[PDB]
Amino acid sequence: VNSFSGYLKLTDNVYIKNADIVEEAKKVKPTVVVNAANVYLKHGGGVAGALNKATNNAMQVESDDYIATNGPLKVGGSCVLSGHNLAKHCLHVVGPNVNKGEDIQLLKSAYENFNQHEVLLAPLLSAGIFGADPIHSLRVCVDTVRTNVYLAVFDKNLYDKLVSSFL
Ligand SMILES: CS(=O)(=O)NC(=O)[C@@]1(F)CN(c2ncnc3[nH]c4cc(F)ccc4c23)CC12CCC2
Hints:
This protein is an alpha/beta fold. The chain contains six helices and seven strands. It has helices at about 20-30, 45-55, 60-70, 105-110, 135-145, 155-165; strands at about 10, 15-20, 30-35, 80, 90-95, 120, 150-155. The strands form two sheets. It has a four-stranded mixed sheet with strand order 1-2-7-6, sandwiched between helices. A three-stranded mixed sheet has the order 3-5-4, with helices on one face. Helix 5 links the parallel strand 6 and strand 7. The longest helix is centred in the middle third of the chain and has 13 residues, at about 60-70. It is globular, with a radius of gyration of 14 Å. The two termini are about 25 Å apart. The relative contact order is 0.21. Bound molecules: ligand R8K. Ligand R8K binds near residues 129 and 130. The PDB classes it as viral protein.
């Protein structure tokens, strides 16, 4: 039993809700919240900009030190950093950005990072400003992640479309 509330169950291990991931994180305080990161951990907009703002920019300060030490992430890769006031940990995961010409096949590699964590609150990778089809992203999530994933979908219209079209 865990504290996630109001989710629709899609499969044995994948759950979905219409929710603001920032507000969901602040309430649940999950062990892991997933950030829709880029390779530079520049949290300017989308989910990343919203998560960072909610930490009062502490996420960005920590991220800049991480990059200065380690260099950029790989597309499809991840790193574990602090969850600040939102979660114990933040798993920064880089899905491919279609608006940058990145290979969509890397979306499966991106979701594989979730399997290193027993339970996660996450957005749909490569959705939103990353330019991928969220329905596809949901399919890859279901077919790749084996650990327990709670997907927060900000847009109500999109959430209803994801549920209604789910095979
Ligand atoms: C409109 S969207 O639904 O298409 N979402 C997108 O475009 C995104 F940019 C933003 N994302 C979020 N996901 C869950 N909670 C969220 N709270 C937020 C609060 C914000 F001020 C901004 C973004 C989010 C957000 C997902 C996304 C796809 C990959 C990044």
